[PDB]
Write an enzyme that holds these catalytic residues in place. Structure first.
Site: not given
Ligand SMILES: Cc1cc2nc3c(=O)[nH]c(=O)nc-3n(C[C@H](O)[C@H](O)[C@H](O)COP(=O)(O)OP(=O)(O)OC[C@H]3O[C@@H](n4cnc5c(N)ncnc54)[C@H](O)[C@@H]3O)c2cc1C
Ligand SMILES: Cc1cc2nc3c(=O)[nH]c(=O)nc-3n(C[C@H](O)[C@H](O)[C@H](O)COP(=O)(O)OP(=O)(O)OC[C@H]3O[C@@H](n4cnc5c(N)ncnc54)[C@H](O)[C@@H]3O)c2cc1C
Ligand SMILES: CC(C)(COP(=O)(O)OP(=O)(O)OC[C@H]1O[C@@H](n2cnc3c(N)ncnc32)[C@H](O)[C@@H]1OP(=O)(O)O)[C@@H](O)C(=O)NCCC(=O)NCCS
Ligand SMILES: CC(C)(COP(=O)(O)OP(=O)(O)OC[C@H]1O[C@@H](n2cnc3c(N)ncnc32)[C@H](O)[C@@H]1OP(=O)(O)O)[C@@H](O)C(=O)NCCC(=O)NCCS
Ligand SMILES: Nc1ncnc2c1ncn2[C@@H]1O[C@H](COP(=O)(O)OP(=O)(O)O)[C@@H](O)[C@H]1O
Lengths: 553, 557
Positions: A22, A43, A276, A280, A435
């Protein structure tokens, strides 16, 4: 135009690759994944095994064809990066099907290799036919196929962390008997002991056998016999190993990149390794916890997703927003119970020798006069001087995820316990109270910070009573159903003011009620009258849940 | 030093009054605290009243959170129900109280006076309203008992609700609940003034699906046939069995006016940073006072229970010299249940920002309540309003069947913590399949807004597109050919997103390109690709889904 090569194509890898496209049409982006699928919902795997997710295809979010097409991406599945050649700026990729290798040059390299299951050295772990760890789809198909063919009556789960518990739930629901074996004295390490007591009690009501402070000594008769360190023997049909994960950092290690805690890849604020041109992200990296800036490893999907999207911006985006650490916000479904945590817990704070105060506040998920209101228990951990929030934990049947997210937001915005009562959250009977639970925990913490109340904890009271503390229970008699703390003297809150002459003035007074609220109000009364008084945090309900064998009738 | 005991008189025993009294007692045992309430009940849940009428709440006693006897004992309070304060004598420092039971009046000396008198229902001067027999307003328990008795004894089959505010809507929902046919008559072109027009369009759909008749841009001209016939301004007639008025509220500030106290906007009681009125000894809180809105710091009136409760609790500390924490103003966070739909809002809406000449941008993002692969994921729509320069958030609106309250609370928390839209993506929220996605809807609207703030994308609104097409704009629909059977925007040319890179040749370089998809996401990705190839392109915020909901009469099939 740059050549960017991304290793790993799930949470971190797919995130960075998509944003990178993008940001720039010009770059050549190569994504290398060792498995057969990209962007799969790992998951969701336990829910698939549990039959909650009925459709296998749903677990496969985007296909390689569609994504490579949509983002003009060179995606290479079943390709294992075996070596990083950092002086040459090339990597060696091995085909998984043929074992043939080839080199691929890069201008920039991004590692998101994730974490792998820890396997312990248990005698007989190699003879074990029905021993499974859960990380990817093939592992999942293995377990699923096993359950189809052998129809196991009983499963043993080794390790009571987040993975282990979800696995317990999902096997249970399939109708399989389950034993959870845990080395620690509790399930779920990120939460504190007293909170885990609610979880243990709930899992027991669903017929899970919990074995604490025990481990497997051996796996006999092909894994079908589990010998425990305590001498107990478990007959079982399958064994799920869920004892933690370790960073998949052997690639970085091989390349001579600097490592950190637990063998994580060490990175700077811009996710740059000691080289450089190599970056990660994901489970494999060392993160600083947001709260204390202690270097840690926190393998969760939200962070892996955010780190990838941020790194994309670092490489090809505008201003550099830097990663200010992980809070570690997590949530789990435990049968009918939601459990959530954020920041640091007491066990970590004690280990770091940081002073803290805690407050336990139970309130309803919504207006109590509205149908189906259910308790929400919130534990807040904070600095008594500044009111800095160190962390929070919450559990209950509903409206838990809502309150955790509000507090997580507060902590990242650097709000103090003193700011919590000022959070104007939505009120309507079906959703909250005038509350909210969050405001209420804010008020309880603020009273402690401002010195309006002094409290003692569940783990202190019995010892205080043995040492001549005068303990007043201010519950109405009808509330005394489930028992009391040994040493208790009942004086209901509504009689107390008339019955003042009964409270000794030469003694330390300790007050307890059911949840802590009326104990607070009784404390304020007696303080304003000159008594030395402390309220028992969490009331009898917490005490009796965590220490049920100490309840007196 | 410490605290000298004083006599504190509180006028009003519900939201503002009760919360101040209770905290004041916690702060000091010695103070004499007197609470004067004109109704029979203190601390009842008036937010529950509609639900009691709808039978959702079945025990009347459940609306009574605290009893007089219990509360006065617990807090050693002198609670005087059925007692009306009729005059404040501010120089004498007394009030005149009428015991409504025995008709006896007396004067009560105070050291400190706290006014929490609330807001009363606006009753319009419609001809025939005096003779209207089944016309009801709703404020307290007796009003509720009357309406409920009427339903049970007279068995209405049709009800008309005048006023489409949050309370009018709640009445509508609860009347349908009892099996009553309902017509809602609104003067505006939308229900619920806080939410913007295109968001209301979704609400209208859901109410119409539950068989509510919506009559917009119409008012009641007269009540004929003893309230059984409602004649509308257009000229239309509605035959009904009962009428509920819910056309707004006005501050109960007659006591202040009479005492010569300063008034703020809309007749509210004017108070300083410490809730002090123009008399040093008289404080005021609740629906009756003038508050600053948190976002713009414009003086306003916001009658909600959370602010009233907060103000009351804060005032108690202020009275005791704890003035560190002063009131920051109200964000105006509100949530509403509309049949199966939850509707939430916070901060300022587009209608208000125009009224103040404040430059803004909006974004509309629809996302799933939780992981899509996890059962029962339902869409959530968030509209976020912000400053394109600063990223300051001006307000947010949310709607959906689940997970709505959660997102609004987060965004409300972000606003009060002074977070910009650039910080929303950095909110680490809990991720588990049953509760959220790896990027929560809040993170998502944050990214969408950040893309606008950073200049990665330029968007046009649903209300701009048609005129832009009329003026020569080239509109490309990037949805798959099949999706077009759901309809499209006039002037659209179809090029599927996946095929777009392959078919760039068909995109004109001599025209302003406008991109639309279903929700805006695919349109954005197409926009990004074309800008990078050097086209001047804009995305239609909200995509076709939004456009077709708000302007269904304009859909080309
Ligand atoms: C069963 C299960 C449930 C979970 N549930 C949750 C949850 O509910 N919430 C939550 O926040 N987190 C959850 N997690 C954790 C979450 O999945 C991880 O934190 C997240 O996936 C980390 O992303 P990553 O990109 O670092 O690693 P991964 O998503 O694991 O991706 C690493 C990828 O890189 C590949 N790879 C590794 N080495 C190489 C190589 N040399 N060459 C090529 N490819 C390589 C691997 O095949 C893997 O596909 C769960 C994990 C599991 C196993
Ligand atoms: C049907 C209904 C539903 C609502 N739903 C919601 C909701 O979902 N969410 C939300 O945030 N808000 C809701 N509200 C509004 C909320 O109830 C008010 O904002 C809140 O009660 C205002 O607090 P207050 O203390 O200013 O006024 P009130 O609670 O109105 O209390 C004022 C009290 O003072 C008494 N009083 C007035 N004058 C005198 C006098 N001269 N002498 C003695 N006593 C006097 C009155 O009788 C009244 O009891 C709802 C209101 C209604 C009517
Ligand atoms: C889905 C996946 C394949 C690709 O991610 P992606 O292309 O960034 O897609 P997302 O939906 O996350 O992002 C949507 C983009 O559209 C934007 N967007 C979404 N809806 C929009 C709307 N209505 N209007 C405008 N923009 C919108 C977002 O801002 C974002 O763009 P940006 O990042 O350039 O700002 C990748 O995230 C993945 O691998 N996911 C599964 C991995 C995972 O989370 N695993 C854990 C196990 S469940
Ligand atoms: C209920 C009502 C009397 C409030 O009185 P209250 O004594 O403040 O009652 P709460 O339950 O809010 O108690 C909160 C207090 O207990 C404390 N508390 C709550 N849980 C606690 C716990 N577990 N441990 C210690 N303290 C606790 C809070 O800190 C707070 O004390 P503080 O205000 O001194 O800090 C009042 O709000 C009321 O009448 N409400 C209904 C009316 C209303 O809101 N109407 C509008 C429409 S709903
Ligand atoms: N030998 C062992 N036997 C039983 N449980 C163990 C053993 N070693 C570690 N554990 C437990 O297993 C759990 C690991 O969970 P965690 O660290 O959250 O990883 P995961 O989330 O992947 O399960 C911890 O509760 C830990 O105490």
């Amino acid at each position: 135009s740059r050549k960017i090569v991304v290793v790993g194509g799930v949470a971190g890898g797919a995130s960075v690759a998509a944003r990178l496209r993008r940001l720039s049409e010009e770059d050549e982006i190569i994504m290398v994944e060792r498995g057969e699928y990209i962007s799969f919902a790992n998951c969701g795997l336990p829910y698939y095994i549990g039959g909650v997710i009925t459709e296998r295809q749903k677990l496969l979010v985007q296909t390689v064809e569609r994504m490579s097409k949509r983002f003009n991406l060179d995606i290479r599945v079943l390709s294992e990066v075996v070596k990083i050649n950092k002086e040459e700026k090339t990597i060696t990729i091995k085909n998984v099907t043929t074992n043939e290798t080839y080199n691929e040059a890069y201008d920039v390299l991004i590692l998101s290799p994730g974490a792998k299951p820890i396997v312990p050295s248990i005698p007989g772990i190699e003879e074990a036919k029905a021993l499974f760890t859960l990380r990817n789809v093939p592992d999942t198909d293995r377990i699923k196929a096993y359950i189809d063919e052998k129809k196991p009556r009983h499963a043993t789960v080794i390790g009571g962390g987040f993975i282990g518990v979800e696995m317990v739930e999902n096997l249970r629901e399939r109708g399989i008997e389950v034993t959870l074996v845990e080395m620690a004295n509790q399930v779920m390490p990120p939460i504190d002991y007293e909170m885990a007591a609610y979880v243990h009690e709930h899992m027991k009501n669903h017929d899970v056998e919990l074995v604490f402070e025990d481990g497997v000594d051996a796996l006999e008769e092909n894994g079908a016999v589990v010998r425990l360190k305590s001498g107990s023997v478990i007959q079982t049909d399958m064994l799920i190993l869920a004892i933690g994960v370790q960073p998949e950092s052997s690639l970085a290690k091989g390349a001579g990149l600097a490592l950190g805690v637990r063998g994580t890849i060490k990175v700077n604020e811009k996710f740059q390794t000691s080289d450089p041109h190599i970056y990660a992200i994901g489970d494999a990296i060392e993160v600083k916890d947001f709260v204390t800036e202690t270097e840690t490893m926190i393998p969760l999907a939200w962070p892996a997703n955010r780190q990838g999207r941020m790194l994309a911006d670092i490489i090809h985006g505008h201003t550099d927003s830097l990663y200010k650490g992980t809070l570690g916000t997590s949530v789990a479904k435990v049968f009918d119970l939601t459990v959530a945590t954020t920041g640091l817990n007491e066990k970590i704070l004690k280990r770091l020798n940081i002073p803290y105060e805690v407050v336990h506040v139970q309130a309803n998920s919504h207006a109590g006069y509205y149908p189906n209101a259910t308790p929400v228990l919130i534990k807040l951990i904070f600095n008594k001087d500044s009111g800095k929030i160190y962390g929070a934990q919450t559990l209950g049947r509903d409206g838990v995820d809502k309150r955790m997210d509000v507090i997580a937001t507060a902590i990242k915005a650097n709000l103090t316990v003193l700011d919590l009562p000022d959070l104007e959250l939505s009120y309507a009977p079906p959703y909250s109270s005038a509350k909210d639970p969050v405001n209420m925990v804010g008020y309880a913490a603020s009273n402690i910070v401002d010195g309006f109340v002094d409290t003692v904890q569940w783990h202190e009271i019995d010892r205080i009573v043995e040492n001549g503390g005068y303990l007043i229970d201010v519950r109405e008699p009808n509330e005394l159903k489930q028992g009391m703390i040994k040493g208790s003297i009942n004086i209901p809150l509504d009689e107390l003011r008339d019955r003042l002459e009964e409270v000794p003035v030469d003694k330390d007074i300790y007050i307890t009620c059911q949840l802590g609220m009326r104990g607070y109000v009784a404390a304020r009364m007696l303080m304003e009258k000159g008594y030395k008084v402390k309220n028992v945090d969490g009331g009898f309900k917490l005490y009796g849940t965590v220490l049920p064998e100490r309840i007196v009738y």
